[model samples]
Target: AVKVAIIASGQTNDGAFNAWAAEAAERLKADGADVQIRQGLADPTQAEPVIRQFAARGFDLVVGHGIDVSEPILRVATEFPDVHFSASGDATLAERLPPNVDGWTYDFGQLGYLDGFVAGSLRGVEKVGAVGGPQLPFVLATHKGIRAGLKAANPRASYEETYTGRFYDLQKEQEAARGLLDKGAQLLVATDDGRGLGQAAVAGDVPTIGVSAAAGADIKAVNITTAKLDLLPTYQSYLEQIRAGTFGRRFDVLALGNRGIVLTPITAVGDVVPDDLQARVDALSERLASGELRLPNFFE
Candidate 1:
């Protein structure tokens, strides 16, 4: 059996980005690989030693679950040419990669666009508020997609956006959420890892778009829908390529069209949404998948 190890930046069971990687680990184990996961290694200094230990132990694959590990993984990847290394994140790397390394970029904007469409279509929603983390390339792309999607769904809908400047600051996120709500925003969207805005929506009595995972289940009263990243297929494909000796140093991008990312069911606020809206969104998703609907690539 192939020995694999995954280094995650947060708790593996957070039911968010880290959870996706944890799911990947489970799938790999079920497929007969020896898998191990090390979570809460957000800092590269903390991850470097663990990654080195995995490589020294002759593991066949090492996956860094966040962009924070890109440099650390790369630093040690060249030292072990026989082991495959992968870095999965929302942004592309700036450095050229070694032959054994794989760069994975998940197009978060695709799902953000879908979320915005739903927010725009909500009844009596004059303005949609979005609270995001630091304005990185991926986060900016998501914001742009949200604006475009809201315009497509409701031309007159206004938008307000704020960045908390930190990925996991719950207090800042909640403050931002309350400020938007105070300004008469009716719908909310959170792109931060902590989902602090989601927590705030529970009390604000407004529909919210869940980010990273299906958070609707946790806060069902207000969470209308969620956009989740399913990376099992991506990991499986990478493993297959490695086995076939075809894997190379290249940037692999995954989007909604390819099943890499998906939108959860509109459950919590289904009654409020028009019955036909679900079908319309499904059709839009198909168009996105078929290349008929092209969201702006702000990262480019």
Candidate 2:
């Protein structure tokens, strides 16, 4: 059996990014692999020692659950030539890993497009607003997807976005959301870690769509849906590659067609969107996963 060690940045039970990795860990464990998940290792100072510990323990695979642990994982991977390590992030991060590591990335545009499509379905979405986080490639691609999705759903719908330069700061996120709301933004889309966006939507009594896992489950009163990333396939791929001697410097893309980006079912506290929106999004998702529908790739 393959010995696997998964390191997550936040609480494993947060039902968000870290939880997604924890889900992957469970699947790996059930499939005859020796799996261990270590959470709350966001900083390099905290993650480096544990990563090295896993490597020294004869673990065949060590997974850095998110970009927060990239630097430490990269540093530790160099020290363990025999272990196959992995990290998650955008294409750029995927392209720059050492030979003994695997890289995983998700389709940011697909996630944003689906969430944006939902927002566009609203009756008064003429001026949709978004509260954005870091201005990274994935984040930028999501913005592009939001615009594209809104246009596709309703040609007359206009969109605007504001970045707070922070990943998970609630105060900054709320400020950006309020700015959008005050500007007559009828709907909200946020890429933050948790309910900061949804909380803002609640105060403004606006229907908001989430782009990360936290928004999907955190604030049901306002968050209609979320663009959730599923990483189970990536973990499965890692184990398969290790067993097959094909784990060196592999880049696993979690694209729409690859079952990477998944849109959560609409579960808002307020009835704002169309009743049949979930079915509509499902058809679009199936089309996306089958390559029947293609969205521009802003990942470059």
Candidate 3:
């Protein structure tokens, strides 16, 4: 069996980024690998010991399920050169990692852009608000992409954002959402609050766009669309590489072209969205998927 250890810095069932990693762990286990899943590591300081223990125990693969745990994994990797390691985050993760380490990333900017495209395509969505958790580079990139995509669709559209510094806190996220709603925000984009953001969106009867499957189905009345990331294939590739003895330093980026991310069909939600909005967004999606069009400097 291919023994592996996967660790996360937060709850595995938050229906946010952490849940993505949790799904990956399940995939590995179902593939007949001896996968040990660990969550709620607090931070790197608290993560290092468990990582080291996993490596020390001779696990073939040690996967850091969050960006915060990447450095901790690398720190432990030095002592176990033979152990394969993977870090989940932006594409830059592999640049400074050792040979045994690899990274997983996706076109998060595009994910946000698509979500924004739908919001901006709406006729009355002039004021857009966003509530997010942890102002990281990737999060910032998505926020920027949302603005870019919004402006691209409707030049007069305006955007505003807030950060709660926490992901799983429903109250804080709801409070932030209310602040935007009070500011005349016609639509809301959620970064990662599970049901908190979506719940507020529903309460306000404002259409919402979220990344991944973070929002609850009960909010479908106001939930317009979400970008879903499929990481099972990527994780499968990593396992295949490790089994083939070719696992080395590399950053595998998941993009629309690679089918790494797919957006859910636009929900009209009581005809709140324009009838033609879905077609326009679908065309945009095709262009993005084919690389015929790109979000200019989305990272900028």
Comparing 1 and 3 by TM-score, which wins?
A: 1
- Cα-based lDDT at residue 15, candidate 1: 62
Task: Name the candidate, 1 or 2, with the larger lDDT value.
Answer: 2
Model 2, global lDDT: 0.80
Per-residue lDDT for 11 in model 3?
A: 80
For candidate 1, the per-residue lDDT at 184 reads 81
The C-alpha lDDT values of all candidates are 0.78, 0.80, 0.78
User: What residue pairs clash in candidate 1, if any at all?
Assistant: none
Which regions of candidate 2 deviate over 4 angstroms?
A: 9-15, 40-46, 71-75, 78-82, 92-99, 122-124, 134-138, 211-218, 243-246, 275-279, 286-292, 297-300
**Segments of candidate 1 deviating more than 4 angstroms:** 89-95, 121-126, 135-138, 211-221, 274-282
Best by lDDT: 2
Candidate 2: 10-residue stretch with minimal lDDT:
211-220
What CA RMSD would you report for each candidate? 3.1, 3.5, 3.6
Compared with the true structure, the alpha-carbon lDDT of candidate 1 equals 0.78
Writing each residue's lDDT as its tens digit, candidate 2 over 28-74 gives 77677888889898888999999999999899999998889988899
